Scaffold this active site. Structure first.
Site, PDB file in Angstrom:
ATOM      1  N   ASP A  72       0.873  -1.043   0.143  1.00  0.00           N
ATOM      2  CA  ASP A  72       0.029  -0.049  -0.194  1.00  0.00           C
ATOM      3  C   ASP A  72       1.244   1.105  -0.098  1.00  0.00           C
ATOM      4  OD1 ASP A  72      -2.676   1.963   0.220  1.00  0.00           O
ATOM      5  OD2 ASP A  72      -1.462   1.487   2.401  1.00  0.00           O
ATOM      6  N   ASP A  97       0.047   5.171   0.949  1.00  0.00           N
ATOM      7  CA  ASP A  97      -0.753   5.798   2.223  1.00  0.00           C
ATOM      8  C   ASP A  97      -0.187   5.864   3.248  1.00  0.00           C
ATOM      9  OD1 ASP A  97      -1.594   8.399   0.639  1.00  0.00           O
ATOM     10  OD2 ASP A  97      -2.194   6.369  -0.606  1.00  0.00           O
ATOM     11  N   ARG A 114     -13.745  12.999  -0.770  1.00  0.00           N
ATOM     12  CA  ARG A 114     -12.681  13.361  -0.526  1.00  0.00           C
ATOM     13  C   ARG A 114     -11.584  13.822  -1.483  1.00  0.00           C
ATOM     14  NH1 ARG A 114      -9.294   8.879   1.744  1.00  0.00           N
ATOM     15  NH2 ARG A 114     -10.674   7.007   0.498  1.00  0.00           N
ATOM     16  N   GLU A 162      -1.040  10.656   3.887  1.00  0.00           N
ATOM     17  CA  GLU A 162      -1.890  10.624   3.341  1.00  0.00           C
ATOM     18  C   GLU A 162      -1.492  11.442   2.331  1.00  0.00           C
ATOM     19  OE1 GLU A 162      -4.228   8.691   2.854  1.00  0.00           O
ATOM     20  OE2 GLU A 162      -2.872   6.960   4.769  1.00  0.00           O
ATOM     21  N   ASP A 203      -2.036  -0.509   5.959  1.00  0.00           N
ATOM     22  CA  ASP A 203      -2.242   0.274   6.592  1.00  0.00           C
ATOM     23  C   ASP A 203      -3.899   0.166   7.350  1.00  0.00           C
ATOM     24  OD1 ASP A 203      -1.887   1.951   4.947  1.00  0.00           O
ATOM     25  OD2 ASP A 203      -2.705   3.086   6.536  1.00  0.00           O
ATOM     26  N   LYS A 240      -7.862  -4.479  -4.725  1.00  0.00           N
ATOM     27  CA  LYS A 240      -6.885  -4.195  -4.588  1.00  0.00           C
ATOM     28  C   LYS A 240      -6.221  -5.306  -4.738  1.00  0.00           C
ATOM     29  CE  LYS A 240      -5.590  -0.192  -1.929  1.00  0.00           C
ATOM     30  NZ  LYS A 240      -3.753  -0.100  -1.363  1.00  0.00           N
ATOM     31  N   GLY A 261      -5.075   3.154  -4.055  1.00  0.00           N
ATOM     32  CA  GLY A 261      -6.614   3.924  -3.790  1.00  0.00           C
ATOM     33  C   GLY A 261      -6.051   5.475  -4.089  1.00  0.00           C
TER      34      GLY A 261
HETATM   35 MG   LIG Z   1      -3.005   3.225   3.383  1.00  0.00          MG
END
Ligand SMILES: [Mg+2]
Ligand SMILES: [Mg+2]
Lengths: 395, 395
Positions: free
Chosen positions: B183, B185, B227, B192, B338, B315, B271
């Site tokens: 991943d 971020d 977002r 982020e 995470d 994912k 993402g």
């Molecule tokens: Mg992440």
């Protein structure tokens, strides 16, 4: 935590020793820096490096608690101040594999003597196999620049004591091998295809030349031309016939199966013939084949090969090609062969293994195997027999 | 060779002990079946299983020679008949990694207690790191079917004692991992990206939602839409600006560099946004990228993404895709993340690692890491700090 304390527990192994010690240490302000423990033939050694308050380590309470708890159940314990002591041991620089059937005490003794002579420290010894051959691994720390002198000494030990001895880099990089190529004739497969073909022409005798070629007595291409010429006039049917007569080397299936478990790319590079090898490579689910090609006219062998000829330089060229396509650096490649024909390929590979080989190859190869079991290659690649059997029993 | 004899040498390590013993044994008809030796904190244990003539082993000459040679230099030795004794120990079934800063004696004590409670035998303990975190490995033999009960017990120990505890299959196959995805971020990169982007719109606050999404409070796609909508009207220049503000997670370079040494395929699944990630993946020389894509009109962000949306299921789909292209079975894949967004990917991977993760991911992940060092992933993959430093010092 401010000062360092070393606690060493030894004696006859018993259940609960490990738990007991850390439970005792928890009554004191102890944080762990390193733990090492093993049990060998019911003998326990548990070495614990801790940090604790200067308050605690300069008092007899920690000592009395640990000594009383450990001695009561019958083991020994020592406790001493550290501060100058290494926290965690250095990795070994090299590993040494000793294979034999038998491995005499004299043989192993000679290995240990040569090792000690060159200032090499033995960090660990363990068994890696009890079948089909006795296998022992020594992980060692070699003084810088001395590994050349070491391989020479152990090659002499090897020939004199009738065991295989291989010295390998034990670094992170140089031991993540990911690609392997096998010579076919007398390596992956028993005997010589071209001799089986010549037998059909009544020329098995003459085709002398194969032993001449494999020992390095003559140019591979010219020996190939003289040998394949003896096939002139044979019907092409003989190809499938010989293909069906091929026997894998003892341990070959186990070897390939285990290499697949490890994610190896697997291939063959041969001076033999594609029509006989491709049939077998597909069955063995190999990733790469390089081979020569018989000329056929009107369904009959002409006695010539169709160029290009895979010769000594050619085998190395094929290895390079394979490795490039697979994305594997040459340092992480392995090559296994038996003849002088394989000298350049073995030299090009990260690890060049001579398998029951003519002297010409045995002398330039990184490692030599003298027992008629191809799966002894696995031991040189860091696999143990127990691990093979475990994975095989799970399917 | 006809009957089996076990020789066990213990005591304070000294040079020449190994050589001396086999030299003595060579005066008798001894062939070796197994050798095990280690030195821990200057304590030697050398266990030698041999075969020798019934003639020899039923006489006091072998005993006197060995006992005299070993005792004279100050070590202990025992000698006993075997015949019923295991030749070579079984492989461990599992391995357990304990990471902490600190690792208290109480913490390690709890691990050992839970292990002993479930009838799990500790075969070996060793240190795997002293930096950036204390790392300890226990190789163990778990009773069949009990490894589920074990992971649960040790997850409880982990939360209560403030250490990371990971239980892994130690089989040949399941430990030759060959592919890893991160991943981005808060895993590979600090913080982020979408928050850094929203900060440029003065909307960092609102974009609340990121913490809401990562904990699993709401659908990823709808949280993504709300977002990214906050970015509507920003000039596309902001993309390159944020890209240049990215900081790698501590230990990230070391992590990737070491995985390259091991021949891993490396990729990222995010993402986040391709225009920000591709710039970094090329620099880090990654093999695969999956990401979302910002919609741009007239050089301005519209506040929407261009489908398809990489969501939770997506994912895992990307991981599968990557593994298929690379020829790596899912069992040999690793995934590091995470957020709740990573739940399906981690579940799909052979080894799913939660890195400083929201509770939702920590509870389904194969292993959890709680220290702000991405290179602690390496320890879970069987690498030691010493090995990293050795390979790094050679370049
Ligand atoms: Mg992440
Ligand atoms: Mg050959």
């Amino acid at each position: 935590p401010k000062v360092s304390v070393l606690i060493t527990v030894t004696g006859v192994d018993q259940p609960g020793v490990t738990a007991t010690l850390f439970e005792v240490l928890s009554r004191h302000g102890v944080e762990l820096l390193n733990v090492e423990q093993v049990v060998i033939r019911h003998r326990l050694t548990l070495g614990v490096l801790v940090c604790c308050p200067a308050d605690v380590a300069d008092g007899p309470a920690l000592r009395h608690d640990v000594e009383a708890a450990i001695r009561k159940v019958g083991l020994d314990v020592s406790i001493e101040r550290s501060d100058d002591v290494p926290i965690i041991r250095e990795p070994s620089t090299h590993t040494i594999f000793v294979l034999g059937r038998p491995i005499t005490a004299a043989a192993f003794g000679a290995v240990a003597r040569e090792v000690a002579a060159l200032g090499v420290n033995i960090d660990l010894i363990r068994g890696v196999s009890d079948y089909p051959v006795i296998g022992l691994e020594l992980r060692v720390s070699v003084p810088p620049g001395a590994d050349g002198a070491l391989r020479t000494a152990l090659n002499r030990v090897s020939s004199e004591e009738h065991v295989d001895v291989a010295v390998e880099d034990y670094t992170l990089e140089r031991r993540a091998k990911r690609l392997i190529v096998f010579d076919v004739d007398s390596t992956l497969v028993q005997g010589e295809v071209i001799e089986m073909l010549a037998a059909k022409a009544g020329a098995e005798g003459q085709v002398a030349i194969t032993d001449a070629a494999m020992r390095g007595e003559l140019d591979f291409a010219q020996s190939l031309q003289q040998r394949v010429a003896t096939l002139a006039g044979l019907p092409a049917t003989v190809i499938d016939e010989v293909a069906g007569q091929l026997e894998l080397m003892p341990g070959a299936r186990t070897t390939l199966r285990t290499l697949r478990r490890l994610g190896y790319a697997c291939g063959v590079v041969s001076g033999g013939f594609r029509r006989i090898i491709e049939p077998l490579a597909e069955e063995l689910m190999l990733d790469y084949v390089a081979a020569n090609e018989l000329e056929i006219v009107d369904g009959t062998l002409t006695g010539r090969v169709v160029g290009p000829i895979i010769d000594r330089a050619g085998k190395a060229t094929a290895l390079r090609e394979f490795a490039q396509r697979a994305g594997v650096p040459m340092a992480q490649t392995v090559a296994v062969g038996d003849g002088a024909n394989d000298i350049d390929m073995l030299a090009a590979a990260g690890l060049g293994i001579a398998f029951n080989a003519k002297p010409a190859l045995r002398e330039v190869a990184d490692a030599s195997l003298s027992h008629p079991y191809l799966d002894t290659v696995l031991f040189l690649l860091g696999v143990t027999r127990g691990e093979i059997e475990a994975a095989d029993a799970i399917d």
